[PDB]
Design a protein around this ligand. Structure first.
Ligand SMILES: CCNC(=O)[C@H](Cc1ccc(C#Cc2ccc3nccnc3c2)cc1)NC(=O)c1ccc2nc(C)c(C)nc2c1
Lengths: 977, 276
């Protein structure tokens, strides 16, 4: 980091040595913030005391080329950049005549900064798939760009300000009852140019009225195609023709009993801020065979010398190579092994024979192999421990079977893994060529073998070829959760009735597991059923994208269901898992990447989070290249948003550097030395300007204003989290809030916390629509890098610990609640603490989150209760009901006999109705966890971890039976009640 | 002899979750099998987990009218008789595509002869002392991994620094060729006229380029040696983890085996929980 290699401190004056075109050398003493434009001016009027000057002939025609910290020779075309931020490797600058487009090179500098790696890195890769993907992904980029500019500047606005609506026009009945005659009181704020004076409006309008009549009807009270409606405060506009309550903001106001206040803005004013989309194709955009089914021979692979293995010669007796053909996670045959050899000469000049014929190889077959070391000691014990692993696709992206010699680099064993093979892993060679290398050699057939096209498979299928009363079994199998055990009697039963399963589209995932994939006869028939299958819901079709269904045709059908059903409302919800599914794709050019990229280039809210989810995973070396190419394509066509993404990336980098000094250098100090040191390194112009006037990564609609250094301290929790405080640049700040507080954590993993906060949101949405009023507070969390992320701060929230310390027992929490809100609001505050308390009891128990205490449980002044610091889940039935005596007093309105009180009985009822509601949606939650197995979380390695959910939800038991399992757990934790 | 109660069968395991079944059948030969209660928990199901073709099959033993079987004809007196019939014959009769002879059952008694000190007192001390050994070994392994990951990051930024040094040295080297070639036409003119000041400045600063370029080479040379030293320690850290992983796994399994043995024999874990 810093402004120079090693030395992060930049002296105000440094002897910078340049290299003039005539081969001359002259030293200079420039400024840290001096722009390169000035540097050229001073430098050129400094050679008069040197040998030669006739070659210059002018002050222009020179670009000040030099080297950067990324081992890249940057060109520095943007002469306005300050020397401080140039990231110079060493003080020096060579003067060269202009070369290249001079305009596309400037863009490549902004693209590299956002992605984090030089764009030239992708140009130095000789892999044909890497280059082909770059030239082909520009088709989706061009189509999306043309799509945005179709109708008018209006279409441009909808891209930058996508309406945040819900895929549910009809309000839930209970919320509708909150409206007196289905009418919502809204205040419209119109600003008059003279003196920028505010104005008021009382509006009573029907809930199912679009902003068009809201705006027009408001005009009648003033006493057209202009005067758009904007949310007072953050950047949120009411543009698309939707019912007024369809939006998320207006719906939230209804649910919380608040009058929404909106701003009236002229349409022409908004369109002035919209810039033009200038997308120009980059330089790289302009630049027999016998079928596989005719080759009659068993798949044979020859191993050879392994470059080296890090194994002690004495600790481990001998090593061997374990191999096996896999399709998804299920082997296609028995794993083969090589003869054990001493761990000094890993020769392995052996031919491995597999029980699978070449024509029977599925298109998604992989060769998972690993180096295992057999102990062969302890008398009668034989322990195998893997030393490395590596997957190899049998068909390159062109449908050609791999032939001839091939060198493969192995990967380090994942932490906490004991299986000899790693079928669930990225299929590629290790980029770091300094790791164990295994040399393979696939037999040569005297020609290139190509997997048969679609036409050939169709001929084979349907070529080898009424109702049933007992169709209830098919219905029963459909409802079973994805992780449920399926017996060989059902597998042989679904396949026989495969033709009658089309009437039950939900059975497709179950019918895809009953087909033997190592038999071209059966796979050919399956491709016909998938071709003309009815479309299923995105929730069900989202599980066909995980690692259990690697067939290109099965995954292509699933994506086609997402395109026609996945609304942008739901897309932003599951976008966390959809990005992870991108790591299960066999090749770089998928149908999911083209669907995901088209949505990102059409919606700026999806693009914002699409960029950050991919960016946060670029520290992984397994998906560093796959996501790097995906970000470069998006950044090239994202438009003018790349200028905003540079402000956020640059700002987040300052905090990361600053936060790494408080936990690395000044860590053994007092609390006031750190605070003064932290305050000292925030008034500098370099730090001050970088951390102001940019959008908040958590919520793009919130533009962070001027910093408030007075109220920015260091949280005395975790590992010195940094409590940053900002302002609200817009004039309409008091209506929403006048401060954007964000906790910046550097050292804590925010992926488990980011996934829990999304399960809570889905849980609360299920209960809200069902009818239950269980209110939760799923604040915003986001991971921006390697164990570094941001956490939103909730307004006016105190931990239960604070009240007890400040309230000084058992009535302190109830006493404080009574004091804060006295009168007729006490009943509401006592019922809000009850509904909120019940919601977190069911959610906490089902997921088995870390044990709760009075330190990570927060209670608002309004009475609402919410939990923070989601440490771990599913690891660390065997987890009790977290309810504690401090809340029974509040639940029973201060009554001492809480055990058998009337109020407590209603509390139990809302816990049962909530528990049963989720149990009916166990499929949705099982699928969410099934798409994060490869995420890398320590507690989500395989389906074994997800077995916890199937036990806390009592999925195998009966609906009635499952209820009393929850009853027993709740009573046991409280020892009765 | 041929047919006792299913409870006293070496392959029957009772009620074990599918997670436990997979670990026991993991990396086992073809034909290995073990019976156990079904997931639904309903009386008389006895799912028969089987291992064939690398995959763990699963066959349900249907019960009806006090008889057991696989297909709809339940022509068997009990589970033991049914299993014993297929222990001496292949399953091709049941399923044409299912070929296995149920050779190697996963006997639950074999694991029994791995634990000593049948008395409660002796097992309590051994398990408690093993946990200290397992906990200490796990902590030592944890320290190595953080060093291993930390050292991996250090080498990565050393490689980049060397990569950058190549570019910087290349620029100076390339300019020297350009500078020498440029000082070719005017050199003769300088020699013709008695101008010593130009010669000194041209040579004085020309050597400065040589001195600066020489320093760059020396700085890169130290980094390469440092990278080599760092790389060697990287392998050594890897060696220790590779030789500690197999021992940690064995200790964890043996420690867990004793813990389950104590709990299964009518002993509450609360007393063992404080023992640790
Ligand atoms: C024995 C020593 N004790 C302390 O020193 C207490 C204890 C204490 C207080 C408050 C939370 C909290 C919290 C929190 C955490 C996660 C959340 N996640 C989502 C939403 N809200 C959240 C709120 C914890 C702990 N004071 C602080 O540590 C502290 C430090 C810096 C601060 N700087 C500002 C600007 C402000 C307003 N207060 C500060 C409070």
């Amino acid at each position: 980091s810093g402004e120079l290699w090693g030395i992060h401190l930049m002296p105000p004056r440094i002897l910078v040595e340049c290299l003039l075109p005539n081969g001359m050398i002259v030293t200079l003493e420039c400024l840290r913030e001096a722009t390169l434009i000035t540097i050229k001016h001073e430098l050129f009027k400094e050679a008069r005391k040197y040998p030669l000057h006739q070659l210059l002939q002018d002050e222009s025609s020179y670009i000040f080329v030099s080297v950067t910290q990324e081992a890249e020779r940057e060109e520095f075309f943007d002469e306005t950049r300050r020397l401080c931020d140039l990231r110079l490797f060493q003080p020096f600058l060579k003067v060269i005549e202009p070369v290249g487009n001079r305009e596309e090179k400037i863009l490549n500098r902004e693209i590299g900064f956002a992605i984090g790696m030089p764009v030239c890195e992708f140009d130095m890769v000789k892999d044909p798939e890497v280059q082909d993907f770059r030239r082909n992904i520009l088709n989706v980029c061009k189509e999306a760009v043309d799509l945005r500019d179709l109708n008018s500047p209006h279409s441009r606005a909808m891209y930058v300000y996508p309406p945040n609506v819900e895929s549910s026009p009809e309000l839930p009945k209970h919320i509708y009852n909150k409206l007196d005659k289905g009418q919502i009181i809204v205040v419209i704020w119109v600003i008059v140019s003279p003196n920028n004076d505010k104005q008021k409006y009382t509006l009573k309008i029907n809930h199912d009225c679009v902003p068009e009549q809201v705006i027009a009807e408001a005009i009648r009270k003033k006493t057209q195609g202009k005067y758009i409606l904007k949310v007072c405060g953050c950047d949120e506009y009411f543009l698309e023709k939707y019912p007024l309550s369809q939006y998320k903001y207006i719906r939230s106001c209804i649910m919380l009993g608040r009058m929404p206040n909106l701003m009236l803005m002229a349409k022409e004013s908004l369109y002035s801020q919209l810039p033009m989309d200038c997308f120009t194709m980059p330089s790289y955009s302009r630049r027999s065979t016998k079928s596989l089914w005719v080759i009659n021979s068993a798949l044979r692979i020859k191993i050879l010398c392994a470059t080296y293995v890090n194994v002690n010669i004495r600790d481990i007796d001998k090593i061997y190579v374990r191999t096996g053909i896999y399709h998804g996670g299920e082997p296609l045959c028995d794993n083969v092994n090589t003869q054990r050899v001493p761990c000094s000469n890993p020769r392995w000049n052996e031919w491995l024979n597999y029980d699978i014929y070449i024509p029977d190889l599925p298109r998604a077959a992989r060769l998972c192999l690993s180096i295992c070391s057999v102990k062969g000691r302890k008398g009668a014990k034989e322990e195998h421990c893997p030393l490395a692993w590596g997957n190899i696709n049998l068909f390159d992206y062109t449908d050609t079977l791999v032939s001839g010699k091939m060198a493969l680099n192995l990967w380090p064993v994942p932490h906490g893994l004991e299986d000899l093979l790693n079928p669930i892993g990225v299929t590629g060679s290790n980029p770091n060529k300094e790791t164990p290398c295994l040399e393979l050699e696939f037999d040569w057939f005297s020609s290139v073998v190509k997997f048969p096209d679609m036409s050939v498979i169709e001929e084979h299928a349907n070529w080898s070829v009424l109702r049933e009363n007992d169709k209830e079994q098919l219905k029963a199998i459909s409802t079973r959760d994805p992780l449920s055990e399926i017996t060989e009697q059902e597998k042989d039963f679904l396949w026989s009735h495969r033709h009658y399963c089309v009437t039950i589209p939900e059975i497709l995932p179950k019918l895809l597991l009953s087909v033997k994939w190592n038999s071209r006869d059966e796979v050919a028939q399956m491709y016909c059923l998938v071709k003309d299958w009815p479309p299923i819901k995105p929730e069900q079709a989202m599980e066909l994208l995980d690692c259990n269904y690697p067939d290109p045709m099965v995954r292509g059908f699933a994506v086609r269901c997402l395109e026609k059903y996945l609304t942008d409302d739901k897309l932003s919800q599951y976008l966390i898992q959809l990005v992870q599914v991108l790591k299960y794709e066999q090749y770089l050019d998928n149908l999911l990447v083209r669907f995901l990229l088209k949505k990102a280039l059409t919606n700026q809210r999806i693009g914002h989070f699409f960029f950050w989810h991919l960016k946060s995973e670029m520290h992984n070396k397994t998906v560093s290249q796959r996501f790097g190419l995906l970000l470069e394509s998006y950044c090239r066509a994202c438009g003018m948003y790349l200028k905003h993404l540079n402000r956020q990336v640059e700002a987040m980098e300052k905090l990361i550097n600053l936060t790494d000094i408080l936990k690395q250098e000044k860590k053994d100090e007092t609390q006031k030395v750190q605070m003064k040191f932290l305050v000292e390194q925030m008034r500098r112009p370099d730090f001050m300007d970088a951390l102001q006037g940019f959008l908040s990564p958590l919520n793009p609609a919130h533009q962070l204003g001027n910093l408030r250094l007075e109220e920015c301290r260091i949280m005395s929790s975790a590992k010195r989290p940094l409590w940053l405080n900002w302002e609200n640049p817009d004039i309409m700040s008091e209506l929403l809030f006048q401060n954007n507080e964000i906790i910046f954590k550097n050292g804590d993993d925010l992926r488990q916390d980011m996934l829990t906060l999304q399960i809570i949101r889905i849980m609360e949405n299920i209960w809200q629509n069902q009818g239950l009023d269980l209110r939760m507070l799923p604040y915003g969390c986001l991971s921006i890098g390697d164990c570094v992320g941001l956490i939103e701060v909730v307004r006016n929230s105190h931990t239960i610990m604070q009240i007890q310390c400040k309230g000084g027992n058992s009535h302190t929490l109830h006493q404080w609640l009574k004091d804060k809100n006295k009168g007729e609001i006490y009943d509401a505050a006592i019922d809000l603490f009850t509904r909120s308390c019940a919601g977190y009891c069911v959610a906490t128990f089902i997921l088995g989150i870390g044990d709760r205490h009075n330190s990570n449980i927060m209670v608002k002044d309004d009475g609402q209760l919410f939990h923070i610091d989601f440490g771990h889940f599913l690891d660390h039935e065997r987890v009790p009901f977290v309810l504690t005596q401090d809340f029974l007093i509040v639940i029973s309105k201060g009554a001492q006999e809480c055990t058998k009180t009337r109020e407590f009985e209603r509390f139990q009822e809302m816990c049962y109705k909530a528990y049963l509601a989720i149990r009916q949606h166990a499929n949705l939650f099982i699928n969410l966890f099934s798409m994060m197995l490869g995420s890398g979380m320590p507690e989500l390695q395989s389906f074994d971890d997800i077995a916890y959910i199937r036990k806390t939800l009592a999925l195998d038991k009966t609906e009635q039976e499952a209820l009393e399992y929850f009853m027993k757990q709740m009573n046991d934790a409280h020892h009765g009640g | 002899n041929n047919n006792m109660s299913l409870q006293d069968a070496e392959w029957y395991w009772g009620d074990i979750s599918r997670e436990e079944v997979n670990e026991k059948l993991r990396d086992t030969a073809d034909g290995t099998f073990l019976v156990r209660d079904a997931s639904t928990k309903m009386h008389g199901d006895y799912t028969l987990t089987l291992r064939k073709g690398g995959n763990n099959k699963l066959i349900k033993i249907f019960h009806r009218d006090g008889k057991y079987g696989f297909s709809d004809p339940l022509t068997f007196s009990s589970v033991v008789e049914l299993i014993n019939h297929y222990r001496n014959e292949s399953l091709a009769q049941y399923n044409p595509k299912l070929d296995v002879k149920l050779l190697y059952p996963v006997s639950k008694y074999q694991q029994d002869q791995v634990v000593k000190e049948d008395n409660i007192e002796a097992v309590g001390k051994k398990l408690h002392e093993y946990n200290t050994q397992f906990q200490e070994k796990s902590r030592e392994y944890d320290r190595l991994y953080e060093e291993y990951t930390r050292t991996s990051q250090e080498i990565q930024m050393k490689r980049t620094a060397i990569e950058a040094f190549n570019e910087t040295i290349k620029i100076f080297e390339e300019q020297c060729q350009t500078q020498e070639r440029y000082s070719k036409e005017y050199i003769e003119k300088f020699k013709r006229e008695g101008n010593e000041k130009e010669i000194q400045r041209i040579m004085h600063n020309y050597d400065k380029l040589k001195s600066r370029i020489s320093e760059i080479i020396d700085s890169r040379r130290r980094l390469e040696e440092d990278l080599k030293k760092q790389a060697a320690e990287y392998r050594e850290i890897d060696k220790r983890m590779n030789s500690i992983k197999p021992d940690l796994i064995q200790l964890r399994k043996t420690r867990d085996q004793y813990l389950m043995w104590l709990t299964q024999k009518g002993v509450r874990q609360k007393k063992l929980n404080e023992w640790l």
